[PDB]
Ligand binder design. Structure first.
Ligand SMILES: O=c1[nH]c(NC[C@H](O)[C@H](O)[C@H](O)CO)c([N+](=O)[O-])c(=O)[nH]1
Ligand SMILES: O=c1[nH]c(NC[C@H](O)[C@H](O)[C@H](O)CO)c([N+](=O)[O-])c(=O)[nH]1
Ligand SMILES: O=c1[nH]c(NC[C@H](O)[C@H](O)[C@H](O)CO)c([N+](=O)[O-])c(=O)[nH]1
Ligand SMILES: O=c1[nH]c(NC[C@H](O)[C@H](O)[C@H](O)CO)c([N+](=O)[O-])c(=O)[nH]1
Ligand SMILES: O=c1[nH]c(NC[C@H](O)[C@H](O)[C@H](O)CO)c([N+](=O)[O-])c(=O)[nH]1
Lengths: 147, 149, 152, 147, 149
């Protein structure tokens, strides 16, 4: 049971498909607090328009303040074109790059699904498990291991 | 989407392939920044390059000469008969992401990667579709402000 | 198939980072890697560090942090990704594999790939030495030793 | 309507599928000269075994001399294995990297086709349009805009 | 290029050891072609091996940092299996080999085979009526090594 009362965590989330984003952020926040003793005042939450902006928003934020771990949250749903595949591939590499360039643990809270239902299910609705909870724990664990 | 950026300097680089779709996209972006976010016309630079492949390179060259708070890269790639479309799309997207992360300047994705021309026009606001350029205009202002201030 | 060496690395310091998803398959892999280095290459138990991270996504990051603090001759990254219902599997697998390659090239430290990217659980267990399969961890142990010695 | 009498242009082309390569190179050269007033003596032409060497040949050459723009030309045809897919992906990312790293515009004269007929058609044979011309014009434009 | 001779060239060859049946002929073809057709000296050709294709980029990087080579040939054979392992390793190795060559300035020749089954690999190694691809790689190493001088 890892506890991180002194950890400063950053959460950057996109605003596309808010129906699925909100639950994810909550589950992450609630879990860090209620289960890892992270302090609410130590959790910064920022948003960007879409998943494409996630890597950029995180990079700008960890250059200004100091965080022990970051959680990038976004929901990409396959559409009619190849837009979904290209954005997904670029964003995932971008998030990995920002983490490796900065030395700050970047947790993957990106969902890349085929339809809305799949997203809601992974956000804890319709009998599914909220994946945000897992991301909060990973944030805490990686943040501690980085000291 | 309420944000105002009267002091923001925005750069728009667009390719010239599939101009039928490019033009509306650029207008929607410009119009939205101006009428909805108070950006000043004189603070918006517009440049062009032959194709989407040049977008990353054109943007890189420009943000090295002047100072911008945000950049919008606009291009239209349509699937053809070869694998050309797939390889260019992949490299361009990775290039635009790199330019943004290397420079610290927000780069907005105004790239359409479609199966046929009808899909592009529809996303440019023609034939009953929503003009995606508008969303790009708003995103540029938002990311520009979250960096300058 | 592979062609391991008989090389001995009694002075080698080896690091093993593994994720914790699908532990059923992870455990046998790690054991095989450790046992093989020790019993077959003369690596010393005390010279093998073992760390863990939540998921495969964390592997490149955990390895990067660890080789920045201590000095290792070789690193083995171990994780198990199983195709699910979304495209999550494809995108994480691609990013992690490129990430592990980058950490190895940036640092100069050999990073051994102990990542399984499978369609279902049965395939993972089979590659972990269960149900009549060959334990791939063993091969990784020999590779770690071989690369660690060629870096000296 | 762009003219570049002082531009120095480099062309690196592979030698696999020369039947398609030659016309592509000619089209690019002819167009730069005849339509953009580029001078014959200001156009260097080099070759490398295959498309895989394109990025490397270009990087080496722009480190020795000064060019305003580079055109990389090569032809990849899908074969029986996955070789085509992996080389294509690596070469394209390689050419983009060299352009961004060096600051010198790199024009994409790479064809990634399914069979030989497709390549010849794009080289102007059998009633097709010679793509090399477009690459010549793009080189001139990007070379001028780099100043 | 007429007939290139490189009697003073120093060439490095790193090959993996998976699927040796196909590897050996590939290496021979490359060595023989360099010596017999390009006048490269046997004593100027270093040959190293690594467990698998995943180690090629790393093995090559370590070696060119210790000695000086005019060109490098990376040889490995990947065969599609029952999982997605082949696809991910192939993509990462190919990008890794391109990176090492561009980072170092030393030409890295691609002697990697990414096939669907063993038969395809043997064929490309010169068995069963096929053309030994290692020969072409040898000539490419010599040509690129000379053009770097
Ligand atoms: O986070 C998402 N962003 C999306 N917008 C695209 C992109 O993230 C940027 O907001 C904008 O394209 C300019 O950068 C999506 N779609 O377009 O479908 C989506 O599904 N999810
Ligand atoms: O912007 C585009 N550029 C295209 N040209 C490719 C590239 O952008 C350059 O113009 C040229 O290849 C040399 O750099 C396209 N097609 O070829 O189809 C396309 O659909 N869209
Ligand atoms: O190692 C794995 N990690 C997984 N977790 C995802 C990721 O590795 C991180 O733990 C988390 O996503 C945010 O960092 C997996 N799935 O989700 O399926 C999986 O199959 N294997
Ligand atoms: O330019 C090409 N090079 C090719 N050769 C591969 C590569 O470009 C190098 O010459 C050599 O592989 C070593 O780097 C091709 N095929 O193999 O099919 C091809 O179609 N086109
Ligand atoms: O060179 C190869 N290496 C292989 N081994 C994988 C890898 O190259 C590493 O040696 C090891 O996986 C961890 O470093 C292969 N397969 O697994 O199938 C293969 O086909 N070819």
């Amino acid at each position: 049971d890892l506890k991180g009362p002194e950890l400063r965590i950053l959460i950057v989330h996109a605003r596309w498909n808010l129906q699925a984003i909100e639950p994810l952020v909550k589950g992450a926040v609630e879990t860090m607090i209620e289960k890892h003793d992270v302090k609410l005042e130590n959790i910064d939450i920022e948003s960007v328009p879409g998943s494409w902006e996630l890597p950029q928003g995180i990079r700008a934020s960890i250059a200004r303040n100091t965080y022990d771990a970051v959680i990038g949250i976004g929901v990409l749903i396959k559409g009619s074109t190849m837009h979904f595949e290209y954005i997904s591939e670029a964003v995932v590499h971008g998030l990995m790059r920002v983490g490796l360039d900065s030395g700050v643990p970047v947790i993957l809270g990106l969902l890349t699904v085929l339809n809305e239902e799949q997203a809601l299910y992974r956000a804890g609705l319709n009998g599914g498990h909220n994946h945000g909870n897992d991301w909060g724990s990973a944030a805490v664990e990686m943040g501690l291991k980085a000291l």
